[model samples]
Target chain A: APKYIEHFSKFSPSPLSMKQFLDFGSSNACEKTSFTFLRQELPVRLANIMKEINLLPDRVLSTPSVQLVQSWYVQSLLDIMEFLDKDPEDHRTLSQFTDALVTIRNRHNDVVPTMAQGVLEYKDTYGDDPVSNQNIQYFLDRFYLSRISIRMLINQHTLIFDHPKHIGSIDPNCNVSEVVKDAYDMAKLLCDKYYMASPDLEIQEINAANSKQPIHMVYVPSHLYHMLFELFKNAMRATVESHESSLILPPIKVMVALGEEDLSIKMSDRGGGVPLRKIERLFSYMYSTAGTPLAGFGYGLPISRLYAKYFQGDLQLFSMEGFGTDAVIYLKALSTDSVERLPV
Target chain B: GAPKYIEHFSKFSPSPLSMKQFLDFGSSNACEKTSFTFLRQELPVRLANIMKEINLLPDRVLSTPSVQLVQSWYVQSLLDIMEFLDKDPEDHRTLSQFTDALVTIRNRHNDVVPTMAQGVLEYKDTYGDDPVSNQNIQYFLDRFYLSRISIRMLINQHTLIFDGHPKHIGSIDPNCNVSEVVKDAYDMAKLLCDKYYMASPDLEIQEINAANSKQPIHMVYVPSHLYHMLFELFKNAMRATVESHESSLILPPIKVMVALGEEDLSIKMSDRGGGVPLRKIERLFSYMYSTAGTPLAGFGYGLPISRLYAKYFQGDLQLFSMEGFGTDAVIYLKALSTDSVERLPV
Candidate 1:
């Protein structure tokens, strides 16, 4: 019911620079078409469609608001390039980055769209009114990237670069298959060890939607795998402490699905869902729900969200109130042509 | 010779004789002359004539020995006054009134002469090998007056005569007018500032015009004797600053100014150095005091004497110093027209 609804054209603008376009790959189609495709052109068409949908009010949108919406689309494309730089094969960083972004976007989506539409409508109703376009953009930019995407990027980059000495070193030039396989093997070992340490906690790995192609790739570099395992053990401990009786936690279930061109992974727990109000804030830095009782500081979810959004990945959540919660992370799958040549 | 020593000794003895009694008794015996008469008839004229005497040894005459003998004679007179006060304790207030006059004489020749006089009298026998027998005689006379006579009078009389007058006998002569006294004090302060005081550039001197009819006279008043003592204290500090800090003695960067009013005079000097410590602050008033690391030689009688002299003049002496800053000493003497009565506690 927002006054202003914007849509993107099928022919979105190409990436800004060669550095950006090639960050995906040195593909010829990508290189030629990146800049010419314009998101701004699509907005005019979408605005016309909105008139039919009765989304457009009697007043036209303000130039500043229209600019802001267009900027967000442009920035989102830039964010996708940035996400690709985080090594799309490194599933942990990619997963966390996507998860954090999706989480923030979903929380603010309702208020953000409404606020954007209202400001545009207000400006349209009052012509030549003294209002700051910059200030509105500042608020929108901060809400989008600073709160959500930036933290995930930091976590992902840190993981990819920061690994313990004993682990197999990361070679940037290595193909995606080599990195993904190493990451998966490490993750599996970490989960197995974690489950062994806490027998009361169950752990399970779900089969991917496609037997050959998994939607989610968890590239738990040796160091990050250890970090994830530690968090798992902590969660298990929390479960035991809350119940006061040793209760077996349902296995940590990881499910991967490939749908059309998109790939998604779901990590679910039978442990009760986080409160709906608190879920959005959970990924924020320094946020803690344990309140001094637990041995853990609540940085895992936030750190996880950071890595998810670092790659071209999105983290989604589906929870039944008072029931268990499922954290679903989505990313673009490598094309079949690329996958065929990928080693192992 | 024995009779002469006895006679001279008795004449200068610690006695309960008034100035009138001494004058009356001195007339009876031709050999026994009172100090007042000696000064009026012989010493004062001799000193004035000696100033013009080309043949006299300038060094010997100005020596601490000669000054000491003179001080001893002055102290003998003070002792007589003290003896009188002791005899009549009921006349304490009356006797105390003369303290200001006595302190004025004491402070008049405090430095250059009286200080030397004190030193000479203190170590007279040690000068056995020196060819200055007159030095011993002068030391005996000057220091005897300062140590014995003046001290006794101060303790007993509690009054001061030269309470606020910087020039006592020196200013009394027709030759030594108010302008000369002001000039001397001002020069002395400036000389000391230049020679010794290591003051910051921020320190400045301002002379208030006495001729200006529009402004009320601004006077910094202190007892005359304490005024001398304040100068001595400041001078000593300045000297120390110069000696320790490697700097030019001729144009040492310091400023001191003297302001004279009809009623009172002020000498303000500032220096650059860490100030007096808290522990030594109280001791600044103690006799024969020395601060840590000050190279100046003194018996520490300067400040205490100054304080006593201020009390006698109905004036106050105070010091303000911060650890890293510097020291400011103020000597306050009441206006001559102001009532000497203490304010009643309301």
Candidate 2:
């Protein structure tokens, strides 16, 4: 067997598969403590998370690393809550949760600083590896930022809704909440099965520099988010199949800002950049680049662009051949008068 | 002036009061032998013979009794010659030569009486006693003579060459021929007279005999001829008077007279006949007829035919008719200038 495989298999029984130690029914733990415990017991705890989110099918386990990272992030957040909820007299459970949290955090920090390191180590050893000559640091930066961005989006949703005013504004018959719930459920289901099937693979997240703006600051109707998600899914699939290890395989960090005049959103990725010659053709119906290893029907970009424009918004692209690609989408911000007219 | 009928004098004698005969020492035999038979019969015959000699045959001949045939032929021939002489000849010699021959022939046979033998022979083929057929013949003869002689009559008028240029006199007026204009006026009067006669057939064709010993006057100046022509013209006019329905035939009164002159014969007819209808007055001379329901059969030929006839005999037919009023017709027949006697002796 390969040396790296052996090393990975022998590593401490993965922090992802220790769910018997978790306590989700109770809400006594502090948020950080819950986060730490959930990360340590990611894979086993993910099944419960998936069941909670109502996405437990085994078919979603196809992307093991993606599933692992997505579940750990969600579970860790759940763990923080559980850790804070236990009675003080139940010192034994609290200490056990605290130990699991610290151990997992320390292990993750030492093993891999970013998702890119893991991918690079895999690429260096695989017999079919084609990215051996690429710069590992560049790839690491992209993986790290991408995973951080997903956490930011989830964190922002939690933080904003925690406020009574925002909760009242978003929860009363708002359909967007349902859209987020659905996305979360789908991610949980995928993570649960992936960990059960692939115990050796580990997925990790690393924080990049602070974003200029909050990554998920703006609120959109659920239908519009569904459309955006579909576009992102297509982009992710392309990155995974067509990109080299040198080419970042992560979703672009997206910042959505609500301005007085317009809703501005920026999504930037570090990957083999969009071909300048094909930039104009990108949003045209059914146009695709040659030589992509990924198979796509090429409908995602045009559908997203069309939806943006339909809402009195605009979609724009910025790219450099050897560097990265970015897309910015803009929609009109609702004034108070307009927001009152919105259907719930 | 009692109406006395002298025995029909068959012989004629000339008066013995001619200075030309005495001065030229010419025989008075020509003068003394002059007779009514000779004058009436021989003069006309000689005129016809002259025309025949010049290859001018009468265009149409009506079948009449031998005597009337001879008379009519002679009269018509004299009229033709008078018209011919009036023409501007291409060769003056032909006219002068013909004139001299006529004079010589008249002097040579001073007492020769005319016979109807030749005229009878000429019309023997279609001669009949049927009045309708004879009337048709008369119409044909009249038309033929007018057609042949009209051009010649215009020539003689010297009115033939107006402003020193040869002018065509046949139906010269654009609106109507001189004869038709006169006839329309005459017919208007005649129709009135006829209407009066119907109302009172006792009204005779008033006659006034001349006191002089002249030929018993079978001819009258009653203007009945004018009245008849007017009747025909008005009939024609009414036929041309387009109306939605049949036109009424009303007769208007006509007054007529004949005046004897030393060198001319005059006949005047006047009428209270409402004259030409106003709408048709302008188109009277045009060869078109009204196509209305009124059955007017005028081909626009009546007046022109009459005028051409009058002209052939060196006679003038004049007309004056007005709308809503009466009409007048005057006919003037001039004697030949060369005739020696001014008047018929008493």
Candidate 3:
């Protein structure tokens, strides 16, 4: 067994079983100790992946897939190192975390699926040892934990960033509604860019002709941008494609409403709605429901939901077969009393 | 407890409600649910605690300039940019926020922009009493925080201009003469040096200091913004390249070479002063630092403020020290007048 699995396995509940350790993934007290453990564990796992990047007797690292794996692993190594180098105890030190988290999140989503596929691609060509097999699974296990940690980190820091006033830090009283438009504006821009890249979509950058009252609530714009962007893009993409004629599609309608308990955005569209059987994967990784590979590990609804849940919010998708779909996202007004979302 | 964990796994998730792999086996089911729970709850806590630990350090290191900025100008700029984009992205969100932050600082000192940028970094004599030293210190902390955090927006401005997204950039350039301003910055730094450090180095350092650049150059930016950034960095570089060796045996020529790439304008500062002094980096933000303790980069706020300037408008500050030789500092700024400003996914 590789040294990592061998060492990490001792923490495993049963011999050769991941289930027991999975339950003990995190503890409030162990994190500081865990971080120190990861400080060493990350490099060893990195070395193993580094070796995997070199295929065959030729030790070929030049292949596009292998290079991708190398770069991704090395990038995360730097990220983790930079993250590790700091004291997690400082209240103010976690600023600008979204930049790092967003960048890393994108990298993780982009690379992990590809890494899984890459291993399979070379599975036959680069025959693995029994030890290699166990190590790979353990590595995958580690990947899952790190992925969990990063998203958690990103969301929490974002909460702190958004509502520093909640934590009693001197900061702006960011209204949730104000943050939504920022997300909407960005989502529209990205949709324009993506559609612009593929002209057949016949989409233009939607004009910001908002005649509605700005819904102001305290929330993280960065996280909301991810949530809103992911949802808006998918809705628009769905609405645009569902129509038999691209030019004659119904306008994507977005409604923002604030209640005493929560603030919500309900985006409805006239695109042909998703099918029943495929709805199951709508919130799954690499989600693909409309009989197309709309978001195959492509960061669609799943992670957006993660972003929503990050701030003690929730998302729901409903669609009717012939006409359209409505996605309702709810964020509690000042959910300062929320716990870490435990994404069911 | 396991049942509750499992129940939460089933009840709390917003995704993979039907991801097929989860149904295939017990381990994948357990692992996936555990991963989801940890990601949603534990990871964030771990990371926050990580940052919390960092904030307790000597400088309260990571929290000061950048975090404080994100909390201030960056947030305001982001809101303003979003508001502007909602109205017309063609508007000068970058310049408006950029100038406003500067104007805010300029006002903090009452129309007199800090002379520290002009090389009169005698932090006390100028920035003093009516604003007690601490008030002045507190004000700049706020000010630098404003500048540094808005850097995130600065990126958006450059991207928008370069990506052919903005219309205001072209007009903003009419008055920006990069070549002249660089020379202007050089003269200012030289004036401060001659008045102070000119116990006099060789003709090489002095002549280079006098002229500012090799030939001449031109470019576009918010002039005072770029000027302040250049003055601070050039002052820092000059301070180190010249003052580090009182009896400088005529060995260093501080060079400012502007090379324009298709996207960014690169300003390279080179010193053969040896890697011995590159550590002389920032002071205003640097807390309780002794001049002698830090072997490189003097105890000054120049470098940090310079970084704030560069990043404020899609430019970047980079310092590289070599194998026992010299150090190169390159400031890369996007020169385009228009492109769409993309926000960080916070």
Candidate 4:
């Protein structure tokens, strides 16, 4: 812990708004600017988040899974900051820097599940004391939110510098209709494997249908994919399982409507919806409705919700007990002012 | 000058029954030996509670002529109800007499909503200058009106049972068609919309599923209650759309999405009318907060009353509004009746 924070005080975390991410360029000068920002920004955000982890109560920090996660963060922080020792002026040094960041970003992929396990272990030790539970919940939200922001920073830089798309992580002309199909394809495959049958999917572009122009916005393709995949997975599972006895299942409906301030996606499913009393728990990491074959760590909904809120957007679930469920995701479409909501 | 109607009824402590208990008594348990006993004891208590609440109203509001007259008639209706409940009718003939009395009470209060609205306006005229007094009046009016709805529901439900009405027990419709109710409410609301704005926005109703079928979504609910809620929502959505699109070449259609699930029937009404912020949305539920330019546009009571109607059966009405865009008003009704109980004041 002390080694990670040794020179952390020299640099402060700099979080960028969605607009700033969108403005990032693939040109040489813009590349240098992004490079400079990340070189200083990464270590600071890493150390700040690391400090939060260490500040957790002794018992929670002492949990085996948590201790393991702590080591991973420390290693990643030290490795990324090591790039600071060598100033990259030529293509060779730049390649090394890009490679190093890619390695770190991939390594953090396991962080979400590992951290989720740590929380489960924490609950195992402490039981359901709501105060401590809420504190941990709040901490996890901030921690994961920070993790997303960091990955975004690294991915955007690398995608722009190394990848041919030159689009970076933020796709200024991202198409909503296309992204929904991509998410549906992946989710349907899983739904078919688990239940042997997946319901049909219909996509309705409300305003776009008449105009013949698909709803497009400036958004991160990956973030949109991740959120839509989670929603589709849940909706498909509900539709299939609820109509198990029927010869044919109802098709899950996806409505994409563009609003003035936000782009809205509404996924309607005929799977038996959860009771009103139980809907609140749908967002809790401790809760999962999946059976054994499709069981996850139960963070999909919660994490997806975090991603939506990261951009000043929102995700809401509406369910009818005996009928079906409707999940709505609102993404900020117009304003570029949605800054990264990093934890203080 | 003197209190004319409320003077007839004496104060009596009352007991309120959960909707679950009322349904239990009205259904298979109707033939139970103690069924009549239960109704006799329960009906009078509910009536007396309404009387008690009306008696507790602020003199400023209670004295308004419209309020005074409504209160007296309401009290007189409750008195008649209690008289019948005291008679303890056992046979079908006597039971029908009791239900006829209840039917009279229900019909007598048909104009209660408008009368109460008038009374509130009159009270504002006298004491609206003080903010605290205004808040107090609004507070009392909410409870008074909610209690009034409860009494009417109890009476209507009992009379329906006596008449052997199919598809409804007391008031809960076991297979209430949500889509039909939306269409009906939309038709009525559009009439008012056209009357006010000289034009009404188009309506689009969709029930989406895999079968590519358009099927009606049914739920365990009271059709009348759903009609009121949908009516209020459609009225608001129409008003907002018409006003927001005043300069546009064509008005956007208000879209209604109906979905029935294992536990809830969700009706989402989306309007392109410029939406209010979340902070302002809260004030929309407050009894006196209205942004209407015309008198018929709104009296600000629609939302709060509609919410009560939804929650009366353990359902809910929520508005998700995005400023600069529009509003999505979602109504969640329990699709199953097993757990749909009356939500009472604490």
User: Which is the leading candidate under lDDT?
Assistant: 4
Please tell me which model should have the higher TM-score, number 2 or number 4: 4
Per-candidate TM-score, chain A? 0.39, 0.35, 0.53, 0.91
TM, every model:
0.26, 0.20, 0.32, 0.71
Each model's lDDT comes to: 0.39, 0.37, 0.46, 0.74
- TM-score of candidate 1 on Cα atoms, chains taken together: 0.26
Q: For candidate 1, lDDT tens digit of each residue in B9-82?
A: 33332223232332233233422112322322222222222222211333443354655455454444434333
Worst 10 residues of 4 chain B by lDDT: B1-10
> Which segments of candidate 2 are over 4 A away from where they belong?
A1-220, A242-251, A290-296, A335-344, B1-346
Instruction: List candidate 3 stretches off by more than 4 Å.
Output: A1-344, B1-106, B109-144, B147-175, B199-217, B249-251, B277-299, B340-346
lDDT of 2 by residue, A13-125 (tens): 22110111112212332444544434333333333323322222232222344355545545454544454455545657646655655443543352222332344335444
Alpha-carbon lDDT of model 1: 0.39
Give candidate 2's error at residue A74 in angstroms: 47
TM-score between model 3 and native? 0.32
In model 2 chain B, the worst 10-residue window by lDDT is B1-10
* Candidate 3 i-RMS: 27.5
TM-score of chain B of 1: 0.41
Candidate 2 chain A: minimum summed lDDT over ten consecutive residues — where?
A198-207
Instruction: List model 3 lDDT by residue over A89-115, tens digit each.
Output: 553334433355456557766665665
Q: Using DockQ as the measure, which candidate wins?
A: 4
* lDDT tens per residue, model 2, B1-346: 1011011211322222222322122132422112222233333333443233222233334233443444444444354334333344455554454444444433432321223223434455554433344444344434433433322322222222221211222212212222333445544533553453332111112112222323322221113233434455444333222221124354333344434334444444544433433234334432222322222344344554455444443454555433333334444444222322112111
